[PDB]
Design a protein around this motif. Structure first.
Motif, PDB file in Angstrom:
ATOM      1  N   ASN A   6       0.828  -1.560  -0.094  1.00  0.00           N
ATOM      2  CA  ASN A   6      -0.212  -0.234   0.304  1.00  0.00           C
ATOM      3  C   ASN A   6       0.632   0.891  -0.112  1.00  0.00           C
ATOM      4  O   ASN A   6       0.400   2.092  -1.223  1.00  0.00           O
ATOM      5  N   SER A  10       1.245   4.369  -2.835  1.00  0.00           N
ATOM      6  CA  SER A  10       0.838   5.707  -2.620  1.00  0.00           C
ATOM      7  C   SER A  10       2.519   5.821  -3.126  1.00  0.00           C
ATOM      8  O   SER A  10       1.498   7.065  -3.493  1.00  0.00           O
ATOM      9  N   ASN A  14       1.439   9.240  -5.462  1.00  0.00           N
ATOM     10  CA  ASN A  14       2.052  10.493  -5.639  1.00  0.00           C
ATOM     11  C   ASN A  14       3.049  10.526  -6.512  1.00  0.00           C
ATOM     12  O   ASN A  14       2.908  12.501  -6.579  1.00  0.00           O
ATOM     13  N   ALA A  64      -4.470   3.850  -6.371  1.00  0.00           N
ATOM     14  CA  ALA A  64      -5.029   4.699  -5.223  1.00  0.00           C
ATOM     15  C   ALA A  64      -5.698   3.292  -4.199  1.00  0.00           C
ATOM     16  O   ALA A  64      -4.324   3.143  -2.859  1.00  0.00           O
ATOM     17  N   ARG A  65      -5.624   2.338  -4.321  1.00  0.00           N
ATOM     18  CA  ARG A  65      -6.121   1.192  -4.322  1.00  0.00           C
ATOM     19  C   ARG A  65      -5.364  -0.191  -4.058  1.00  0.00           C
ATOM     20  O   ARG A  65      -5.971  -1.062  -3.900  1.00  0.00           O
TER      21      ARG A  65
ATOM     22  N   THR C   7      -7.988   4.247   1.486  1.00  0.00           N
ATOM     23  CA  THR C   7      -7.938   4.887   0.493  1.00  0.00           C
ATOM     24  C   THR C   7      -9.010   4.841   0.253  1.00  0.00           C
ATOM     25  O   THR C   7      -9.787   5.979  -0.770  1.00  0.00           O
ATOM     26  N   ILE C  13      -9.300   9.463  -3.094  1.00  0.00           N
ATOM     27  CA  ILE C  13      -9.423  10.089  -4.343  1.00  0.00           C
ATOM     28  C   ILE C  13      -9.004   9.186  -5.456  1.00  0.00           C
ATOM     29  O   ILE C  13      -9.347  10.591  -6.512  1.00  0.00           O
ATOM     30  N   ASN C  56      -1.447  14.943  -2.949  1.00  0.00           N
ATOM     31  CA  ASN C  56      -0.397  14.336  -2.439  1.00  0.00           C
ATOM     32  C   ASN C  56      -0.070  13.718  -0.869  1.00  0.00           C
ATOM     33  O   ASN C  56      -0.072  12.525  -0.396  1.00  0.00           O
ATOM     34  N   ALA C  59      -3.284  11.127  -0.378  1.00  0.00           N
ATOM     35  CA  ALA C  59      -2.778  10.019  -0.735  1.00  0.00           C
ATOM     36  C   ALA C  59      -1.302   9.642  -0.006  1.00  0.00           C
ATOM     37  O   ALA C  59      -1.826   8.336   0.444  1.00  0.00           O
TER      38      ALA C  59
END
Ligand code: ZN
Lengths: 382, 128, 382
Positions: A6, A10, A14, A64-65, C7, C13, C56, C59
């Motif tokens: 995760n 991220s 980012n 994102a997930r 998330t 996001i 960001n 995130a």
């Protein structure tokens, strides 16, 4: 781990979201997700543009997930699924201006392809990020037709385009695509390494002197990555004109246009000495020229360090002296591999002889001394 | 028995959160149902139809129907992403089709999938 | 429970980076950054960079982890602190400032589509951070975005049009979200925003804004000081407009399913009004009872199931009012025929439901208006 998975997802997202990825390029990841793109609109229509864009948006949601977990691939980056779902938008934007460079070559327009090339610089930065922490998109690319992957085909196309001529935009987009390519070569395996043989044909135009130092530096890094293959290692010389070696060494010897600071210089030299070490651990004038170039680089660095010995307090200083160390070990390897070394280095041999006592004194001054380099210097003494 | 004690409330929650009536997808955010879609995808990668005990499997197939026909393609994720999703889906559906005692809760899924395939084929042969 | 839904528990996001949440206009966020369009690129790019940085951050934001023990307060479902969307707030603040400046003068329309997309953005923001909404409410003109969105509500209360019609819906969404996301103590400071709701209670506002307004009314009536203040109005204690909207039925394109959502929200609001302590109830019961009585069995469709539950809690409210206040019966005489025909019908229909309440059932046994007649003359009939 999934926590690390995760966090890496991220990190990827980012690196996509930020201020425009490549400082100075006012365009960002959104600069591509929602593009007006006023006018190839045939192959990539505005509807196809929004299609690639929402493909990408969905993939961005996925990463994102993201929980992409991890000898073939050097580093288990992510094996992330949303990467190949960004692949639609970047494929669109990279076939973009590739079609247009092809068309301008057919004519032999520019006002629009400058903007297109900025867009593609951002896209290639996104590519570098999605080969930073991935491996689904990284492996999918390595799966060509033979033949090549579509995105790989278009990027190699525009790569040959930018490598033929190092004009206004081509140098920058070339630097970006070489960053992408060295990331691929770092993240691939030995099976896909022969697939970059087309890049071996495109590469002489990249190692030409007219190309700026960031580009040629990335090209040397790529060559050193490629060297780890019995099929690619022979793809160095036996070619009279340069074989991507004589060109490299005439570049390092005679730095073209030198529009950069001093520490920017010798970045190429560090990559070159690391590359030659890679080749060693594996008679062209490809063999003969690397001798005088190495001696002259060692010489200029010995001057820059002997003018002010001092302590290695600045990072460029320790970088230069480590370059000196690996350079002299490389010179000893050159003396081991060839006997004509002393004979054909005569045009610069004196500059090596004057450095020899100074370079040995410098080495002995280093609190850390690898016995190999010490005995190598002693062998270099005559 | 751990399954049994919550089987029927689970299926009721499926049917309620995923009613047959169209527009039921507008109530929930497409990223929600998109992660639900990938979830069902990886579930079928597990061969839940074989690995589970109770066929009342019927609820997850009804959920698959909810996704396929009531919910349009391209709303949660892209049509290509949803396409590869339902590809893995129907492949797992074939693997479980090879060995089953009853087909009622499975034949409907295949009918819906092949139905959408027929519709897209008709669209790409719109007049030819 | 280890990922904590970072998330989902984030800004979403994936949602924030998704095709237009509102129907149409095809937006996404920096598409707006691509859109160079508090009136200049000055501070526009500043807000853009702040929003990208906040994105960001969210995130990389893990405010709640493994179960969220940090989120505390009387507010149920405290989402998380999430300081990231704070940095995203300046962008929508600037865009809605431009929008309010475009509204106060008798301009351009694209800013209003950008405005409603910004409202959807706000809805997403306040959806996933309690600290964010707490500062939205706390910060007289505190948090000028709050006062200017109140001004937007006032601007849309008159001269509706279509864009402002959507502004009504999305602003009611974000307010009811902000309202529901705030604790009981914040309702006293939410009273300033509540002062604007009477204009949204004008007989002009469309159905979606109306139902969102009823939701806001319920959220406010959960407070013990906001309910009498809102009932301190002139016309019908601010509820005459609501009741006449039930009977009036201003919109015909509005589906009776949405009308039923409105009705259930109204009756639940009034039930809460009872726990914090007729014409419209009768007419809505008339319509709903006609619809259910035309069907000969339990509602197989969900909409009619909700209609049946609406009958349930509506007769609940009816018996509550009758036992509370005996003026109910001559508040019924003008509609006594509708009442004496719906009450027996709806009571038999709920008797058709196997589940029992014994409270609503006691209500049935209490009212039980029957036979609506004495007898009709059979002579010269028809
Ligand atoms: Zn050679």
């Amino acid at each position: 781990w999934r926590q690390r998975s995760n966090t890496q997802g991220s990190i990827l997202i980012n690196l996509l979201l930020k201020q425009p990825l490549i400082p100075g390029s006012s365009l960002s990841l959104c600069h591509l997700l929602s593009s007006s793109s006023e006018s190839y609109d045939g192959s990539f229509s505005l509807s196809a543009l929004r299609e690639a864009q929402n493909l990408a948006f969905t993939g961005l949601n996925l990463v994102a997930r993201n929980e992409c977990s991890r000898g073939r691939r050097a580093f288990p980056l992510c094996q992330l699924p949303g990467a190949v779902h960004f692949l639609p938008l970047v494929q669109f934007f990279i076939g973009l201006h590739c079609q247009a460079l092809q068309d301008l070559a057919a004519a032999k327009p520019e006002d629009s392809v400058c903007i297109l090339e900025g867009f593609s610089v951002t896209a290639l930065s996104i590519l570098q990020h999605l080969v930073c922490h991935s491996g689904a998109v990284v492996s999918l690319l390595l799966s060509g037709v033979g033949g090549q992957h579509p995105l790989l085909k278009m990027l190699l196309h525009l790569l040959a385009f930018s490598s033929a001529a190092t004009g206004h935009l081509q140098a920058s987009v070339l630097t970006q695509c070489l960053k992408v390519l060295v990331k691929l070569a770092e993240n691939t395996s030995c099976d896909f390494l022969p697939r970059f043989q087309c890049v071996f044909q495109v590469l002489p135009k990249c190692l030409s002197p007219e190309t700026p130092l960031p580009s040629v530096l990335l090209a040397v890094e790529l060559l050193s990555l490629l060297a780890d293959h019995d099929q690619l290692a022979p793809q160095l010389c036996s070619h009279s004109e340069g074989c991507l070696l004589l060109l490299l060494y005439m570049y390092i010897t005679s730095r073209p246009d030198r529009v950069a600071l001093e520490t920017q210089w010798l970045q190429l030299e560090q990559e070159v000495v690391w590359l030659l070490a890679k080749l060693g651990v594996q008679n062209c004038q490809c063999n003969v020229e690397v001798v005088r170039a190495l001696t002259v680089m060692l010489h200029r660095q010995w001057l820059t360090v002997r003018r002010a010995g001092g302590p290695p307090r600045t990072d460029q200083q320790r970088r230069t002296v480590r370059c000196l160390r690996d350079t002299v070990l490389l010179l000893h390897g050159l003396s081991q591999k060839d006997k004509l070394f002393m004979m054909h280095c005569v045009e610069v041999l004196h500059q090596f002889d004057q450095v020899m006592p100074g370079v040995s004194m410098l080495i002995r001054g280093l609190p850390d001394v690898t016995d190999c380099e010490e005995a190598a210097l002693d062998d270099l003494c005559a | 028995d751990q399954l049994k004690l919550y089987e029927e409330p689970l299926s009721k929650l499926i049917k309620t959160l995923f009613p047959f009536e169209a527009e039921a997808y507008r109530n929930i955010e497409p990223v929600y149902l998109n992660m639900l879609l990938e979830k069902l995808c990886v579930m079928f990668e597990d061969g839940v139809l074989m690995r589970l005990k109770s066929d009342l499997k019927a609820a997850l197939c009804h959920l698959l129907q909810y996704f396929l026909k009531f919910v349009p393609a391209g709303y949660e994720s892209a049509l290509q992403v949803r396409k590869v999703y339902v590809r893995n889906i129907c492949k797992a559906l074939l693997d479980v089709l090879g060995i089953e005692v009853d087909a009622e809760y499975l034949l409907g899924p295949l009918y819906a999938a092949l139905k959408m395939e027929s519709m897209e084929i008709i669209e790409e042969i719109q007049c030819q």
